[PDB]
Amino acid sequence: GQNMRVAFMPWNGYNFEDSILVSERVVQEDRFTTIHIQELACVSRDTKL
Amino acid sequence: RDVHPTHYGRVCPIETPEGPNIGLINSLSVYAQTNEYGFLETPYRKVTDG
Amino acid sequence: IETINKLNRISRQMLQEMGREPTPEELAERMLMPEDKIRKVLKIAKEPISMETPIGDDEDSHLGDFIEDTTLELPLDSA
Amino acid sequence: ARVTVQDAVEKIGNRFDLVLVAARRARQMQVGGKDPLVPEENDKTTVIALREIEEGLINNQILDVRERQEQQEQEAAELQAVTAIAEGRR
Amino acid sequence: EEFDAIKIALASPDMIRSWSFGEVKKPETINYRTFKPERDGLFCARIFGPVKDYECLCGKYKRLKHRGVICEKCGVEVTQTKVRRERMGHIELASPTAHIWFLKSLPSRIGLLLDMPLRDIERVLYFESYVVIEGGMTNLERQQILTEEQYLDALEEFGDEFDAKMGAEAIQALLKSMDLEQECEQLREELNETNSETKRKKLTKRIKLLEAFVQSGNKPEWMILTVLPVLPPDLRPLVPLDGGRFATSDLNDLYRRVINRNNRLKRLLDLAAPDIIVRNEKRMLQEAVDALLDNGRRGRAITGSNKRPLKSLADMIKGKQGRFRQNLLGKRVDYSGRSVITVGPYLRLHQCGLPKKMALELFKPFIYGKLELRGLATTIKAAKKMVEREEAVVWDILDEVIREHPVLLNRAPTLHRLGIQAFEPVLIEGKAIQLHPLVCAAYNADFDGDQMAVHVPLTLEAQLEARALMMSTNNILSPANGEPIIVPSQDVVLGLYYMTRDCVNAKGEGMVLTGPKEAERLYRSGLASLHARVKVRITEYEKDANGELVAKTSLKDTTVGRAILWMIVPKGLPYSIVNQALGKKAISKMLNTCYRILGLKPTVIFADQIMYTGFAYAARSGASVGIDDMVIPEKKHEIISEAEAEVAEIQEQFQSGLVTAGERYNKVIDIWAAANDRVSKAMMDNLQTETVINRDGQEEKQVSFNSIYMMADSGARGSAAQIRQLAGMRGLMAKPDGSIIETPITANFREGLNVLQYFISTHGARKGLADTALKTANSGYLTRRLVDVAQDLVVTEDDCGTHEGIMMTPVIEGGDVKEPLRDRVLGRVTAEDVLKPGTADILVPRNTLLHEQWCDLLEENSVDAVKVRSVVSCDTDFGVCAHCYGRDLARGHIINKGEAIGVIAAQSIGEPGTQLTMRTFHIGGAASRAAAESSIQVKNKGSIKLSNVKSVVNSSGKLVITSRNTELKLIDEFGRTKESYKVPYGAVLAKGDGEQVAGGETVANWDPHTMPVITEVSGFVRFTDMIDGQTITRQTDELTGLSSLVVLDSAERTAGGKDLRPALKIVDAQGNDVLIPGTDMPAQYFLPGKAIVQLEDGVQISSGDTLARIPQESGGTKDITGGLPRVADLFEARRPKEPAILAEISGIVSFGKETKGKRRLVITPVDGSDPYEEMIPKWRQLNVFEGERVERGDVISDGPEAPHDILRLRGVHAVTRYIVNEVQDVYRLQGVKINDKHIEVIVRQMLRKATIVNAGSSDFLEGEQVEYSRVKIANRELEANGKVGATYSRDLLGITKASLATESFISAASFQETTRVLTEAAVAGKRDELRGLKENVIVGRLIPAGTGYAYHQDRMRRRAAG
Amino acid sequence: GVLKIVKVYLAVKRRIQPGDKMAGRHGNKGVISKINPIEDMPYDENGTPVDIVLNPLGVPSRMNIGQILETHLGMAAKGIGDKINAMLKQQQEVAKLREFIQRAYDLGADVRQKVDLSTFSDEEVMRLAENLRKGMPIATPVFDGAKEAEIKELLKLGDLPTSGQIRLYDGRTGEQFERPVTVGYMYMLKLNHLVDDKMHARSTGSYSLVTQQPLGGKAQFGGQRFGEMEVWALEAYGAAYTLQEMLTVKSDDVNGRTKMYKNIVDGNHQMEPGMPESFNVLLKEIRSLGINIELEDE
RNA sequence: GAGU
DNA sequence: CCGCGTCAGACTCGTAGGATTATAGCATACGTGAGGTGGGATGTCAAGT
DNA sequence: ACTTGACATCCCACCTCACGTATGCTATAATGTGTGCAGTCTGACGCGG
Ligand SMILES: [Mg+2]
């Protein structure tokens, strides 16, 4: 994965119960962005129709 | 399912799916392998007279 | 039924000669029948698989838990 | 109210009654286009019904009162029509 | 077709003809290429209806113009396809076949009607032997088995008159010919002359079957099936997968085989086939039929082509994956969405974040309506096109609909009713749902990827019920206990704690402030810390009696922080509340008091406030968790090494041999326990305080600000135990099972454990997690059972006017007053007035609901026992009274008439079980219990006064207790029972009766892991029946030749030493039985199973010297492990393994007819003339001396009391009392508080049935088990008119049986035993009147509870009007 | 039966959002609640702003303290990177860089692995420096790991507080937090659980064949099962009409759901219920078993 | 493979 | 009291994809669904009505 | 606003055709067999014996 500067502290209930507060800087750097290669299949069948 | 002293150096006592699968499926410990008869074995160092 | 029987007896031989499978063309060759007819028989050859078939490898679903009724014009279209 | 319908609850008595009596008035607003007493301020009929009963201007008994009244007026006026059909019948 | 009832009976074969439209002659379904239905086949259009709407087979006739048109060529009727769900077909069975269900399912009505065992019938049916139907000849009559050539030896000689046959057809015949009417009368006449007990019981059963049969009008010949009905095709449809492949139901394959074999039978009949093959075919026919109905009941079942057993009709109904539970009592629903939860600090109490794309989809139809009415879209087609593009406009319309709409949030599992709550949804970007922090506790939800469902109540009524009844803001209180569910958690608490906590000097110590606002101004300028001690001028507000404003104006001493908090506090609450450093404790109390005194809306608003505050200050406080924040106590290795070196000394001193296994184990474990607690408290001191830095030379102290420690004391997260494992010593754990390991973990997670230690802990860890899984399904199942039983109980009446009630005490169970009267009784209606000599002769008016304030007044009086009107003692039929129930805890007020209290109770009681399993199973990674039951310690200075014991003074001089009935209480200044302790058998005492104990002095003493048996008299130990191998085991060493005898129990005993009761007889210096002082017993102390006899044969014991110690290892489950089944069992009314016995009526009892050691009691009543003789086991221990004047339900035997017996002797109130307390003991062990009223609800459901002695005008008679409701209905009608009376007695059924007994057979069928219940009701011709809940549920009707009360009572009055 | 087929690969660049699933190696896990603008997040005296803010209250009751150790060692690892990066920007001499680096490795009085540098060529030296510019990667092996004192020792070489706590300035207000907090680098991961998949909702779509109930799963556009549990909840309330909705208009009643749909568009919201198909399923299966069940008229 |  | 038998055992959701069979052939009689062309039924137009 | 007749396009029904379908007949002698997994739990109420 990737390593970030974490600060252990309670925020205004954004870190409530194991919930996570995180920086826009993470998206700025493009860290934790996944590539997902999804597959789809198109099938041309033969009905008696 | 429960944790046997024999698992020492053979299976990780600490790697298993939580829930009804637990106790059933377990990862092979690091250095561990299967012996001749498919029995679990662990490499150990000899100590000769002290 | 008798035609199906021919099919499978020949199938064994052909797999052993080729080292693999029989394509409809190659099969159709050896039988001297029209490929269309062969393919038809291949499809018709499928036996009833059960609606109650546990689709879930984990006893989740009896195939039925998939099947939708396309007969039903949708409440969208009924409106 | 908006947050807590408890005041309206207290005015009627029972929770369940409040819900059903309110539905009947809210339904009337919807159906008959019956006119909302307190200025609307774009509340849903949920809230409209709630407010009216909050102030105590709707009661199950007065809802039935309104029904009795408008039904009596209907019969009075359609005396003319139902009498023609009635003479026909015998 | 707007209906009243449902009746179930045997289907007549000709009734089956009636429903069936056509006969399925061919096994074929359809043509292989053209998938149209075949002629007389399984999917036949001529029989079951047309495939496609309004279009016949051959396709000449289509369109609505043809309705009821009957195509002349093909014979296809022109109609709706829908008919294929409702037309039945049928099969003509050539061999009448018996119905499997009425054979193989117990009891099997055929077998019981003919009083014939299963095997006989089998051999008959399977054509192994013949049987006699009708014997003109006296030699043989009904039901005689004949073999192959016995039938020939019979036929050859007799015949003519002699009638017998083989198989199901023979049984059919015997069924028609048996005389329905005559036999019933015969049996009662039989009864009239002579009735030996068990014979009369079975004869009674049979009478019941027979009478019920002919009243229902069900004909026995119907047991045999001639016509076989065939299920509609749509229910067993045949469908193509898109790949060309097909799927067909298992019904189709069973049915096909049925037809195949039946057709072959037609062929064999026309061919006149030989007997052997004809018989074989009838076997096969029977198989196929019975496989179709219920496969595998008959033994080895038909499998799938796979391997998998074919799924029969029975499976379809019955299974949990069957129709009932999967499709009927619950289903998949539209207008719902599901996704991940995310925190919404900004949301208000009644709100929730609803993702854009989710809500768009959900609220689709609402969108279209408004789109068309506003004219934004020409028609609905264009509205769809306009939604699927998605412009700005779309969002606005969504906004308007969502405005004032409430939506439901659900979390599985539905622990209780608040698992679904209503909120006003607020639209947000993103795909995540936002949940309000406060309500996380009720859903038991936490933010680690949990998902929630969001359903939409669509109608005005749904909307109403959601916002009014289900709204978050409406429901703060647990229906379970009266207390709040929606409350501070974690961070909230932490921030609050931060502010309220006070600190030495810091900034601006001793500043005097004009009002609260100044405080915050000071903090924000950095001219004062919130921790700073301050004088503030503040006006506390007071509620008056009528509800006015009471401003009081002066000097308060608080912190900055508390001044800020007083700002949040609503107008009229006293300062006292915020004055203290608030933890989880103080927080909840504030809310509670606020609710109860102030009221609803204010509390709502205030609760929200407190939430936000907490977040804020948590954030500025800046609390974190560093390595040094976990403080290793200064003296750790010192205290450890000392304990270690001393334990080492006792192990070396082991080889010397004053060291049994028991003593050593005890010694090791105890030294380790004491050392860890030392370590714990030093770690806690260190962490707890630690502000002892020099004030420029000398030092000082105050409450330090350690973050972990703050979380501990705040109750934010940590508790002491967890802390201990982190910074202290991890401690001892549990091995694989019950075994507790000798060497503990001295290290902490701070240090890090090693190979060995970490490995050690894994056992407990894995065990714990496996428990959280597998042991919770038991609790879930249990709960569902409760649910099912508790459905019909609803408030129908306000007050029936009962004077009866149950006397509730403050529970002084042993050690303290664990739950007082106030807590047990709050919000209940009272029955009667209680008098006590008190402050001025207390009297308290009855029929009164005791509110909080009533309670306060009675608290000052200190009444002990209160008769309170109970749910059980309710007079109301089928349900209870508003009064008998009391407060609906969740609402705060009297319960609403109509609300379903039954399910209320069930959910509350199932909820915690399910929770208290899961929690200490995934947080408590090891195992231990508080079992240092070492010494008693009197807390406050008072007199010592004893109730119930008889002690015997020894040589060392201890007051040693030899009684099982001992308590040790404490008297105060002017004579009362304040403190209470429970001391077991063999306990040394210090001060006896009368003498004064000074503060914290040791008055009692006993060693925990060892109950000694102590002798009352002196002299030589004489051995009786303790031979080696039979009853005792030699353990002997060398040295001077010492040993320790172990007297083994039943398991290790050989077959000859079963009855041998080992004893230690008390003989004197002379030989003869020295007798205990004043009493007749020659002292023979019966040493129990495994009694390790230290003091051997030949050592003169002084009076009070130990003869043999008895070890009892309490490993210590605690948790909900041992608890769960115990609870379940009390609720299932299950007689425990050793039930004690009681006395029946009053009067002087006595002995007589004594077997070896089998005690007998002949109780002859002084008033009652009759004597009751009851035999008693040899090994059974007696509590009683001899002649006493007893009352009914006098306990004599040792053990836990059997619920049934208690019911019978004591009656209702006492049994009910026992259940409540005994259950509550378990949940009190876990500290989960639940109101007794719920337990009471259940018990009333368990009392649902009674037993009749004596005939009414109705269908009663001796020993019939009829509903309590039907008895009271008979009462009304018969007492008013006259006729002969009926005597009744109440009966107790547990859970499952009670549920199955209720007159709602669809209810019972939905529960369990689907097959069985159906058959019983079918034979009974039972008629279900549909008053209960689940009935209407399943039919998709209006529940007769609450909101549905109105409509349901309307139908009831419509029953009276014709 | 199949004429032809085309496989198509979609490439989605899927960006992190709120509701995605993230965890550390220590069992501490969580959902993204909000993504804050850089300004909102606390910052160092140095001006370096924070990346993630994790709740300390997740620590003590879960009893994984190793994540704290990782955080501290993680800051010091980056502290190494800090100083090295600085001397890289400041060019300087090979020798001096070599000195710093080697004294770093040989930090432990008790270390096994002795990397006496010396022999290394200038190429390899500056090359190595560049690599450790990003923060030096350390190896605590299992149970045989780095003691707390050696970690403290390295925090001096990072020139940062040995307690691993720093005083933080709130980027919103400018107010400091009253006490220092534990800051440092921890190794985070984004799970295979994407909120993208977890999102799903259904109004109307395909229904079940036999029971005529809504199907299951995002795959069929299926609806959620409102189970007996949920039923129980409704029952606890007096909520009869909502329940009836779930039982009929929302599921197996065809005429009812279609009619109520139209009513909703029209602004009625009247229910007018029908008979759920499941119940008819029930009737017919019982009669197949030769058991007569009739619904009796009043 | 999720969580309670 | 042992016997053996019978009946139970959480909640929701989420993700991968379905076939192996052994099997003779045919000559004849009968039925069932379809193409290819004429009669009858409506469709479209142009004037003239 | 309407009808009439001419001429040109479309819809319904019955006939010959061809493949598809149903059932019979075969002769060295062949004649007592198949077959698996289910289970382990576990307290439980119940009848049978
Ligand atoms: Mg969770």
Ligand SMILES: [Zn+2]
């Ligand atoms: Zn037709």
